[PDB]
Structures are given as C-alpha cells and as structure tokens.
Write a protein that binds this ligand. Sequence first.
Ligand SMILES: O[C@@H]1[C@@H](O)[C@H](O)OC[C@H]1O
Ligand SMILES: O[C@@H]1[C@@H](O)[C@H](O)OC[C@H]1O
Ligand SMILES: O[C@@H]1[C@@H](O)[C@H](O)OC[C@H]1O
Ligand SMILES: O[C@@H]1[C@@H](O)[C@H](O)OC[C@H]1O
Ligand SMILES: [Ca+2]
Ligand SMILES: [Ca+2]
Ligand SMILES: [Ca+2]
Ligand SMILES: [Zn+2]
Ligand SMILES: [Zn+2]
Ligand SMILES: [Zn+2]
Length: 316
Amino acid sequence: ITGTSTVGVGRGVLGDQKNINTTYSTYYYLQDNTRGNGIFTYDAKYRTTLPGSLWADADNQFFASYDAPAVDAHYYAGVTYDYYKNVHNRLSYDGNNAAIRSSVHYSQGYNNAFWNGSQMVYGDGDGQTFIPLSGGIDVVAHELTHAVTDYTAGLIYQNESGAINEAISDIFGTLVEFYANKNPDWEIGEDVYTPGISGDSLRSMSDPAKYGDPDHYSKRYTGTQDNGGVHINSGIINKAAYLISQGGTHYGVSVVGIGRDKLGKIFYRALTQYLTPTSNFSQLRAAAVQSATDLYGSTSQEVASVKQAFDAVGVK
Ligand SMILES: O[C@@H]1[C@@H](O)[C@H](O)OC[C@H]1O
Ligand SMILES: O[C@@H]1[C@@H](O)[C@H](O)OC[C@H]1O
Ligand SMILES: O[C@@H]1[C@@H](O)[C@H](O)OC[C@H]1O
Ligand SMILES: O[C@@H]1[C@@H](O)[C@H](O)OC[C@H]1O
Ligand SMILES: [Ca+2]
Ligand SMILES: [Ca+2]
Ligand SMILES: [Ca+2]
Ligand SMILES: [Zn+2]
Ligand SMILES: [Zn+2]
Ligand SMILES: [Zn+2]
C-alpha cells in the first residue's frame, strides 16, 4: 500500500516488546519500507489461502495476543535482512532486494513454518508441541536461508544434499540469532518448542547426540523417511560448524575455534560460489576448505580448523 512510513510498538510471541516499521494509510499496515522492496506481513485468518490480507492495525499498537505472531514474523524478517546485508552484503534473499512477505495465523494448530518458494508461512502451533513459530528468530532465519540457498546453490532437499541444505539453514539461523544477540545459543527452535518443557529444542548443533542425531559420518541415517534424514544427518554438519567456531575435541580430533563471524564468512562463500544442487558431505568439505583458502590463505589457521572439524565428524 501507499502511505507514510511510521514506527509502531508491540509485543512478540514471548512477550518481548519491540518496535516495528509500519505504513500508515487510514490503518497502520505491517509494511516495512526501510528494507529493499519492503517487508510485508499478512493475516491468513486461520485459513490456508495465501498470502491473505495485509495486516492492518487501528492504533499502531501491537500488544494483543493475536498480534504477537505477526510482530515477530515482521520484526525478525527485518533482522534476517539486516544480517545478510550488513554481514555478507546480500540484499534480501535473492540479492536484488526482493520483498520478504510472511503470513501468520496460517491454518489452525499448525506445528510448522516454511518458505514456500515465494513467501514465509507461520503456523500458530498447537500450544503444547509449538507456540507460534515466528517467535523463534532461528526458525525465521532458518527458513529464509532456504530462499538464499535456492537462489544460489539450489541444493536438493534429499539425501546428503538436503542434509547440507538443512545445515546451512541451521548455521545461518543460529548466526542470525547471535547477530540479534538477545539469548543466542547453538540449539534450534528452543524459544518456541514445547513451552511446558525447559532446556530442550528441536536439535543441538553443539551435541546432536543429545536428541539422537548423528555427530559423525559413520552414524548417518540411511533410511527413506524425512527425505533421507535431512533433519537428522544435518547434525553431522552442524557439529562441524560448531567445532569450527567454538573449537573442541571430538572423537579424539582436536579443533581450534576461529569464531562465529569467520564461520559465517566461510559457509556463505561456500554456498554462493562452490556448492551445486547435488553437493555431498565430501564436496561441502572441499567447498569450505576452498572458501577459507580464498578468504585467509591455504596455510591459515582457518583452513586448518575447517579440515579438523570435518575430520572430527568423519567427513573426508
Ligand atoms: O552446549 C554448550 C555450548 O552452547 C557452549 O558453547 O559450550 C558448552 C556446551 O555445553
Ligand atoms: O544419550 C542419548 C539419549 O539421551 C537419547 O534419548 O537417544 C540418543 C542417545 O545418544
Ligand atoms: O571408524 C570410525 C572412527 O574412525 C571414528 O573415530 O569414530 C567412528 C568410527 O566409525
Ligand atoms: O541413504 C542415504 C545415505 O546413503 C547417505 O549417506 O546420506 C543420505 C541418505 O539418505
Ligand atoms: Ca492495535
Ligand atoms: Ca537457537
Ligand atoms: Ca521447550
Ligand atoms: Zn529447513
Ligand atoms: Zn536462543
Ligand atoms: Zn525443516
């Protein structure tokens, strides 16, 4: 819509107050004009018709429980934008300032959120498995990273390629969570998963075995479910990414940590330059060793740490 850019105030899913960019035209719409071609949040109104109605508010205040999923979807979409722009100099997910559109209140009791190829889609959860998933910045950035992947490497969503595809979204989903720097960690979905249970999450990058996911190539899932365990085998790469950043000893392999910033630089360059739709774990290693060589030199510590981390998880 066409209106005056305004700044509203509201509370997200977890009750945290935050400002959001709005557009005023009789009503205050969730339309952020300060980022690329805009960020738009829509109300699906408990139906599956997308995108729905552009979220309108009467007083520019978003403190109602019904607003909370829209606030976080709108706000965190902007944080993800600020991350890729400021850190990797990428304008939106496509690199050409494409508009980031999101729909909340999708269906009823929907325990999922996903990028549909054109926009984000956030369900409200059932209240026991999930609360509104937009409340998890890592989930938001996770799914928005799938768009970046599609507009670059195009990794398929099956077998090892899909595990990489999932690991890329967990890595940058976690890096965006650190970029926001409110309650960062190396878990996924902890903020919205099982509200009645504390200290758990969907999966752990620091210790994938915590939830039965593999932390080594020899333990990779080989079945047919989950498109070949894309969410399961991703732990092997998540463990590698965690070791590259924070370092540590794993299966007797010592890894020197180089930090989160370089981890993002190494993996962002590997995704945008060297990965192909059918990249496997071994080719990802080569993609990360080449990226670190470009950025820091073949003899640099960063290249060594990358090799160490993939050696630790058994990816040669
Ligand atoms: O999971 C924890 C990790 O986040 C921290 O960085 O180091 C100790 C681990 O227990
Ligand atoms: O110790 C882990 C256990 O907590 C989990 O239930 O299943 C996988 C094991 O590695
Ligand atoms: O043979 C593998 C070993 O090299 C590694 O250290 O841990 C897992 C084993 O399967
Ligand atoms: O069965 C596949 C396995 O061979 C590969 O190693 O990782 C993905 C699985 O789907
Ligand atoms: Ca209001
Ligand atoms: Ca997290
Ligand atoms: Ca929980
Ligand atoms: Zn994913
Ligand atoms: Zn967190
Ligand atoms: Zn998923």
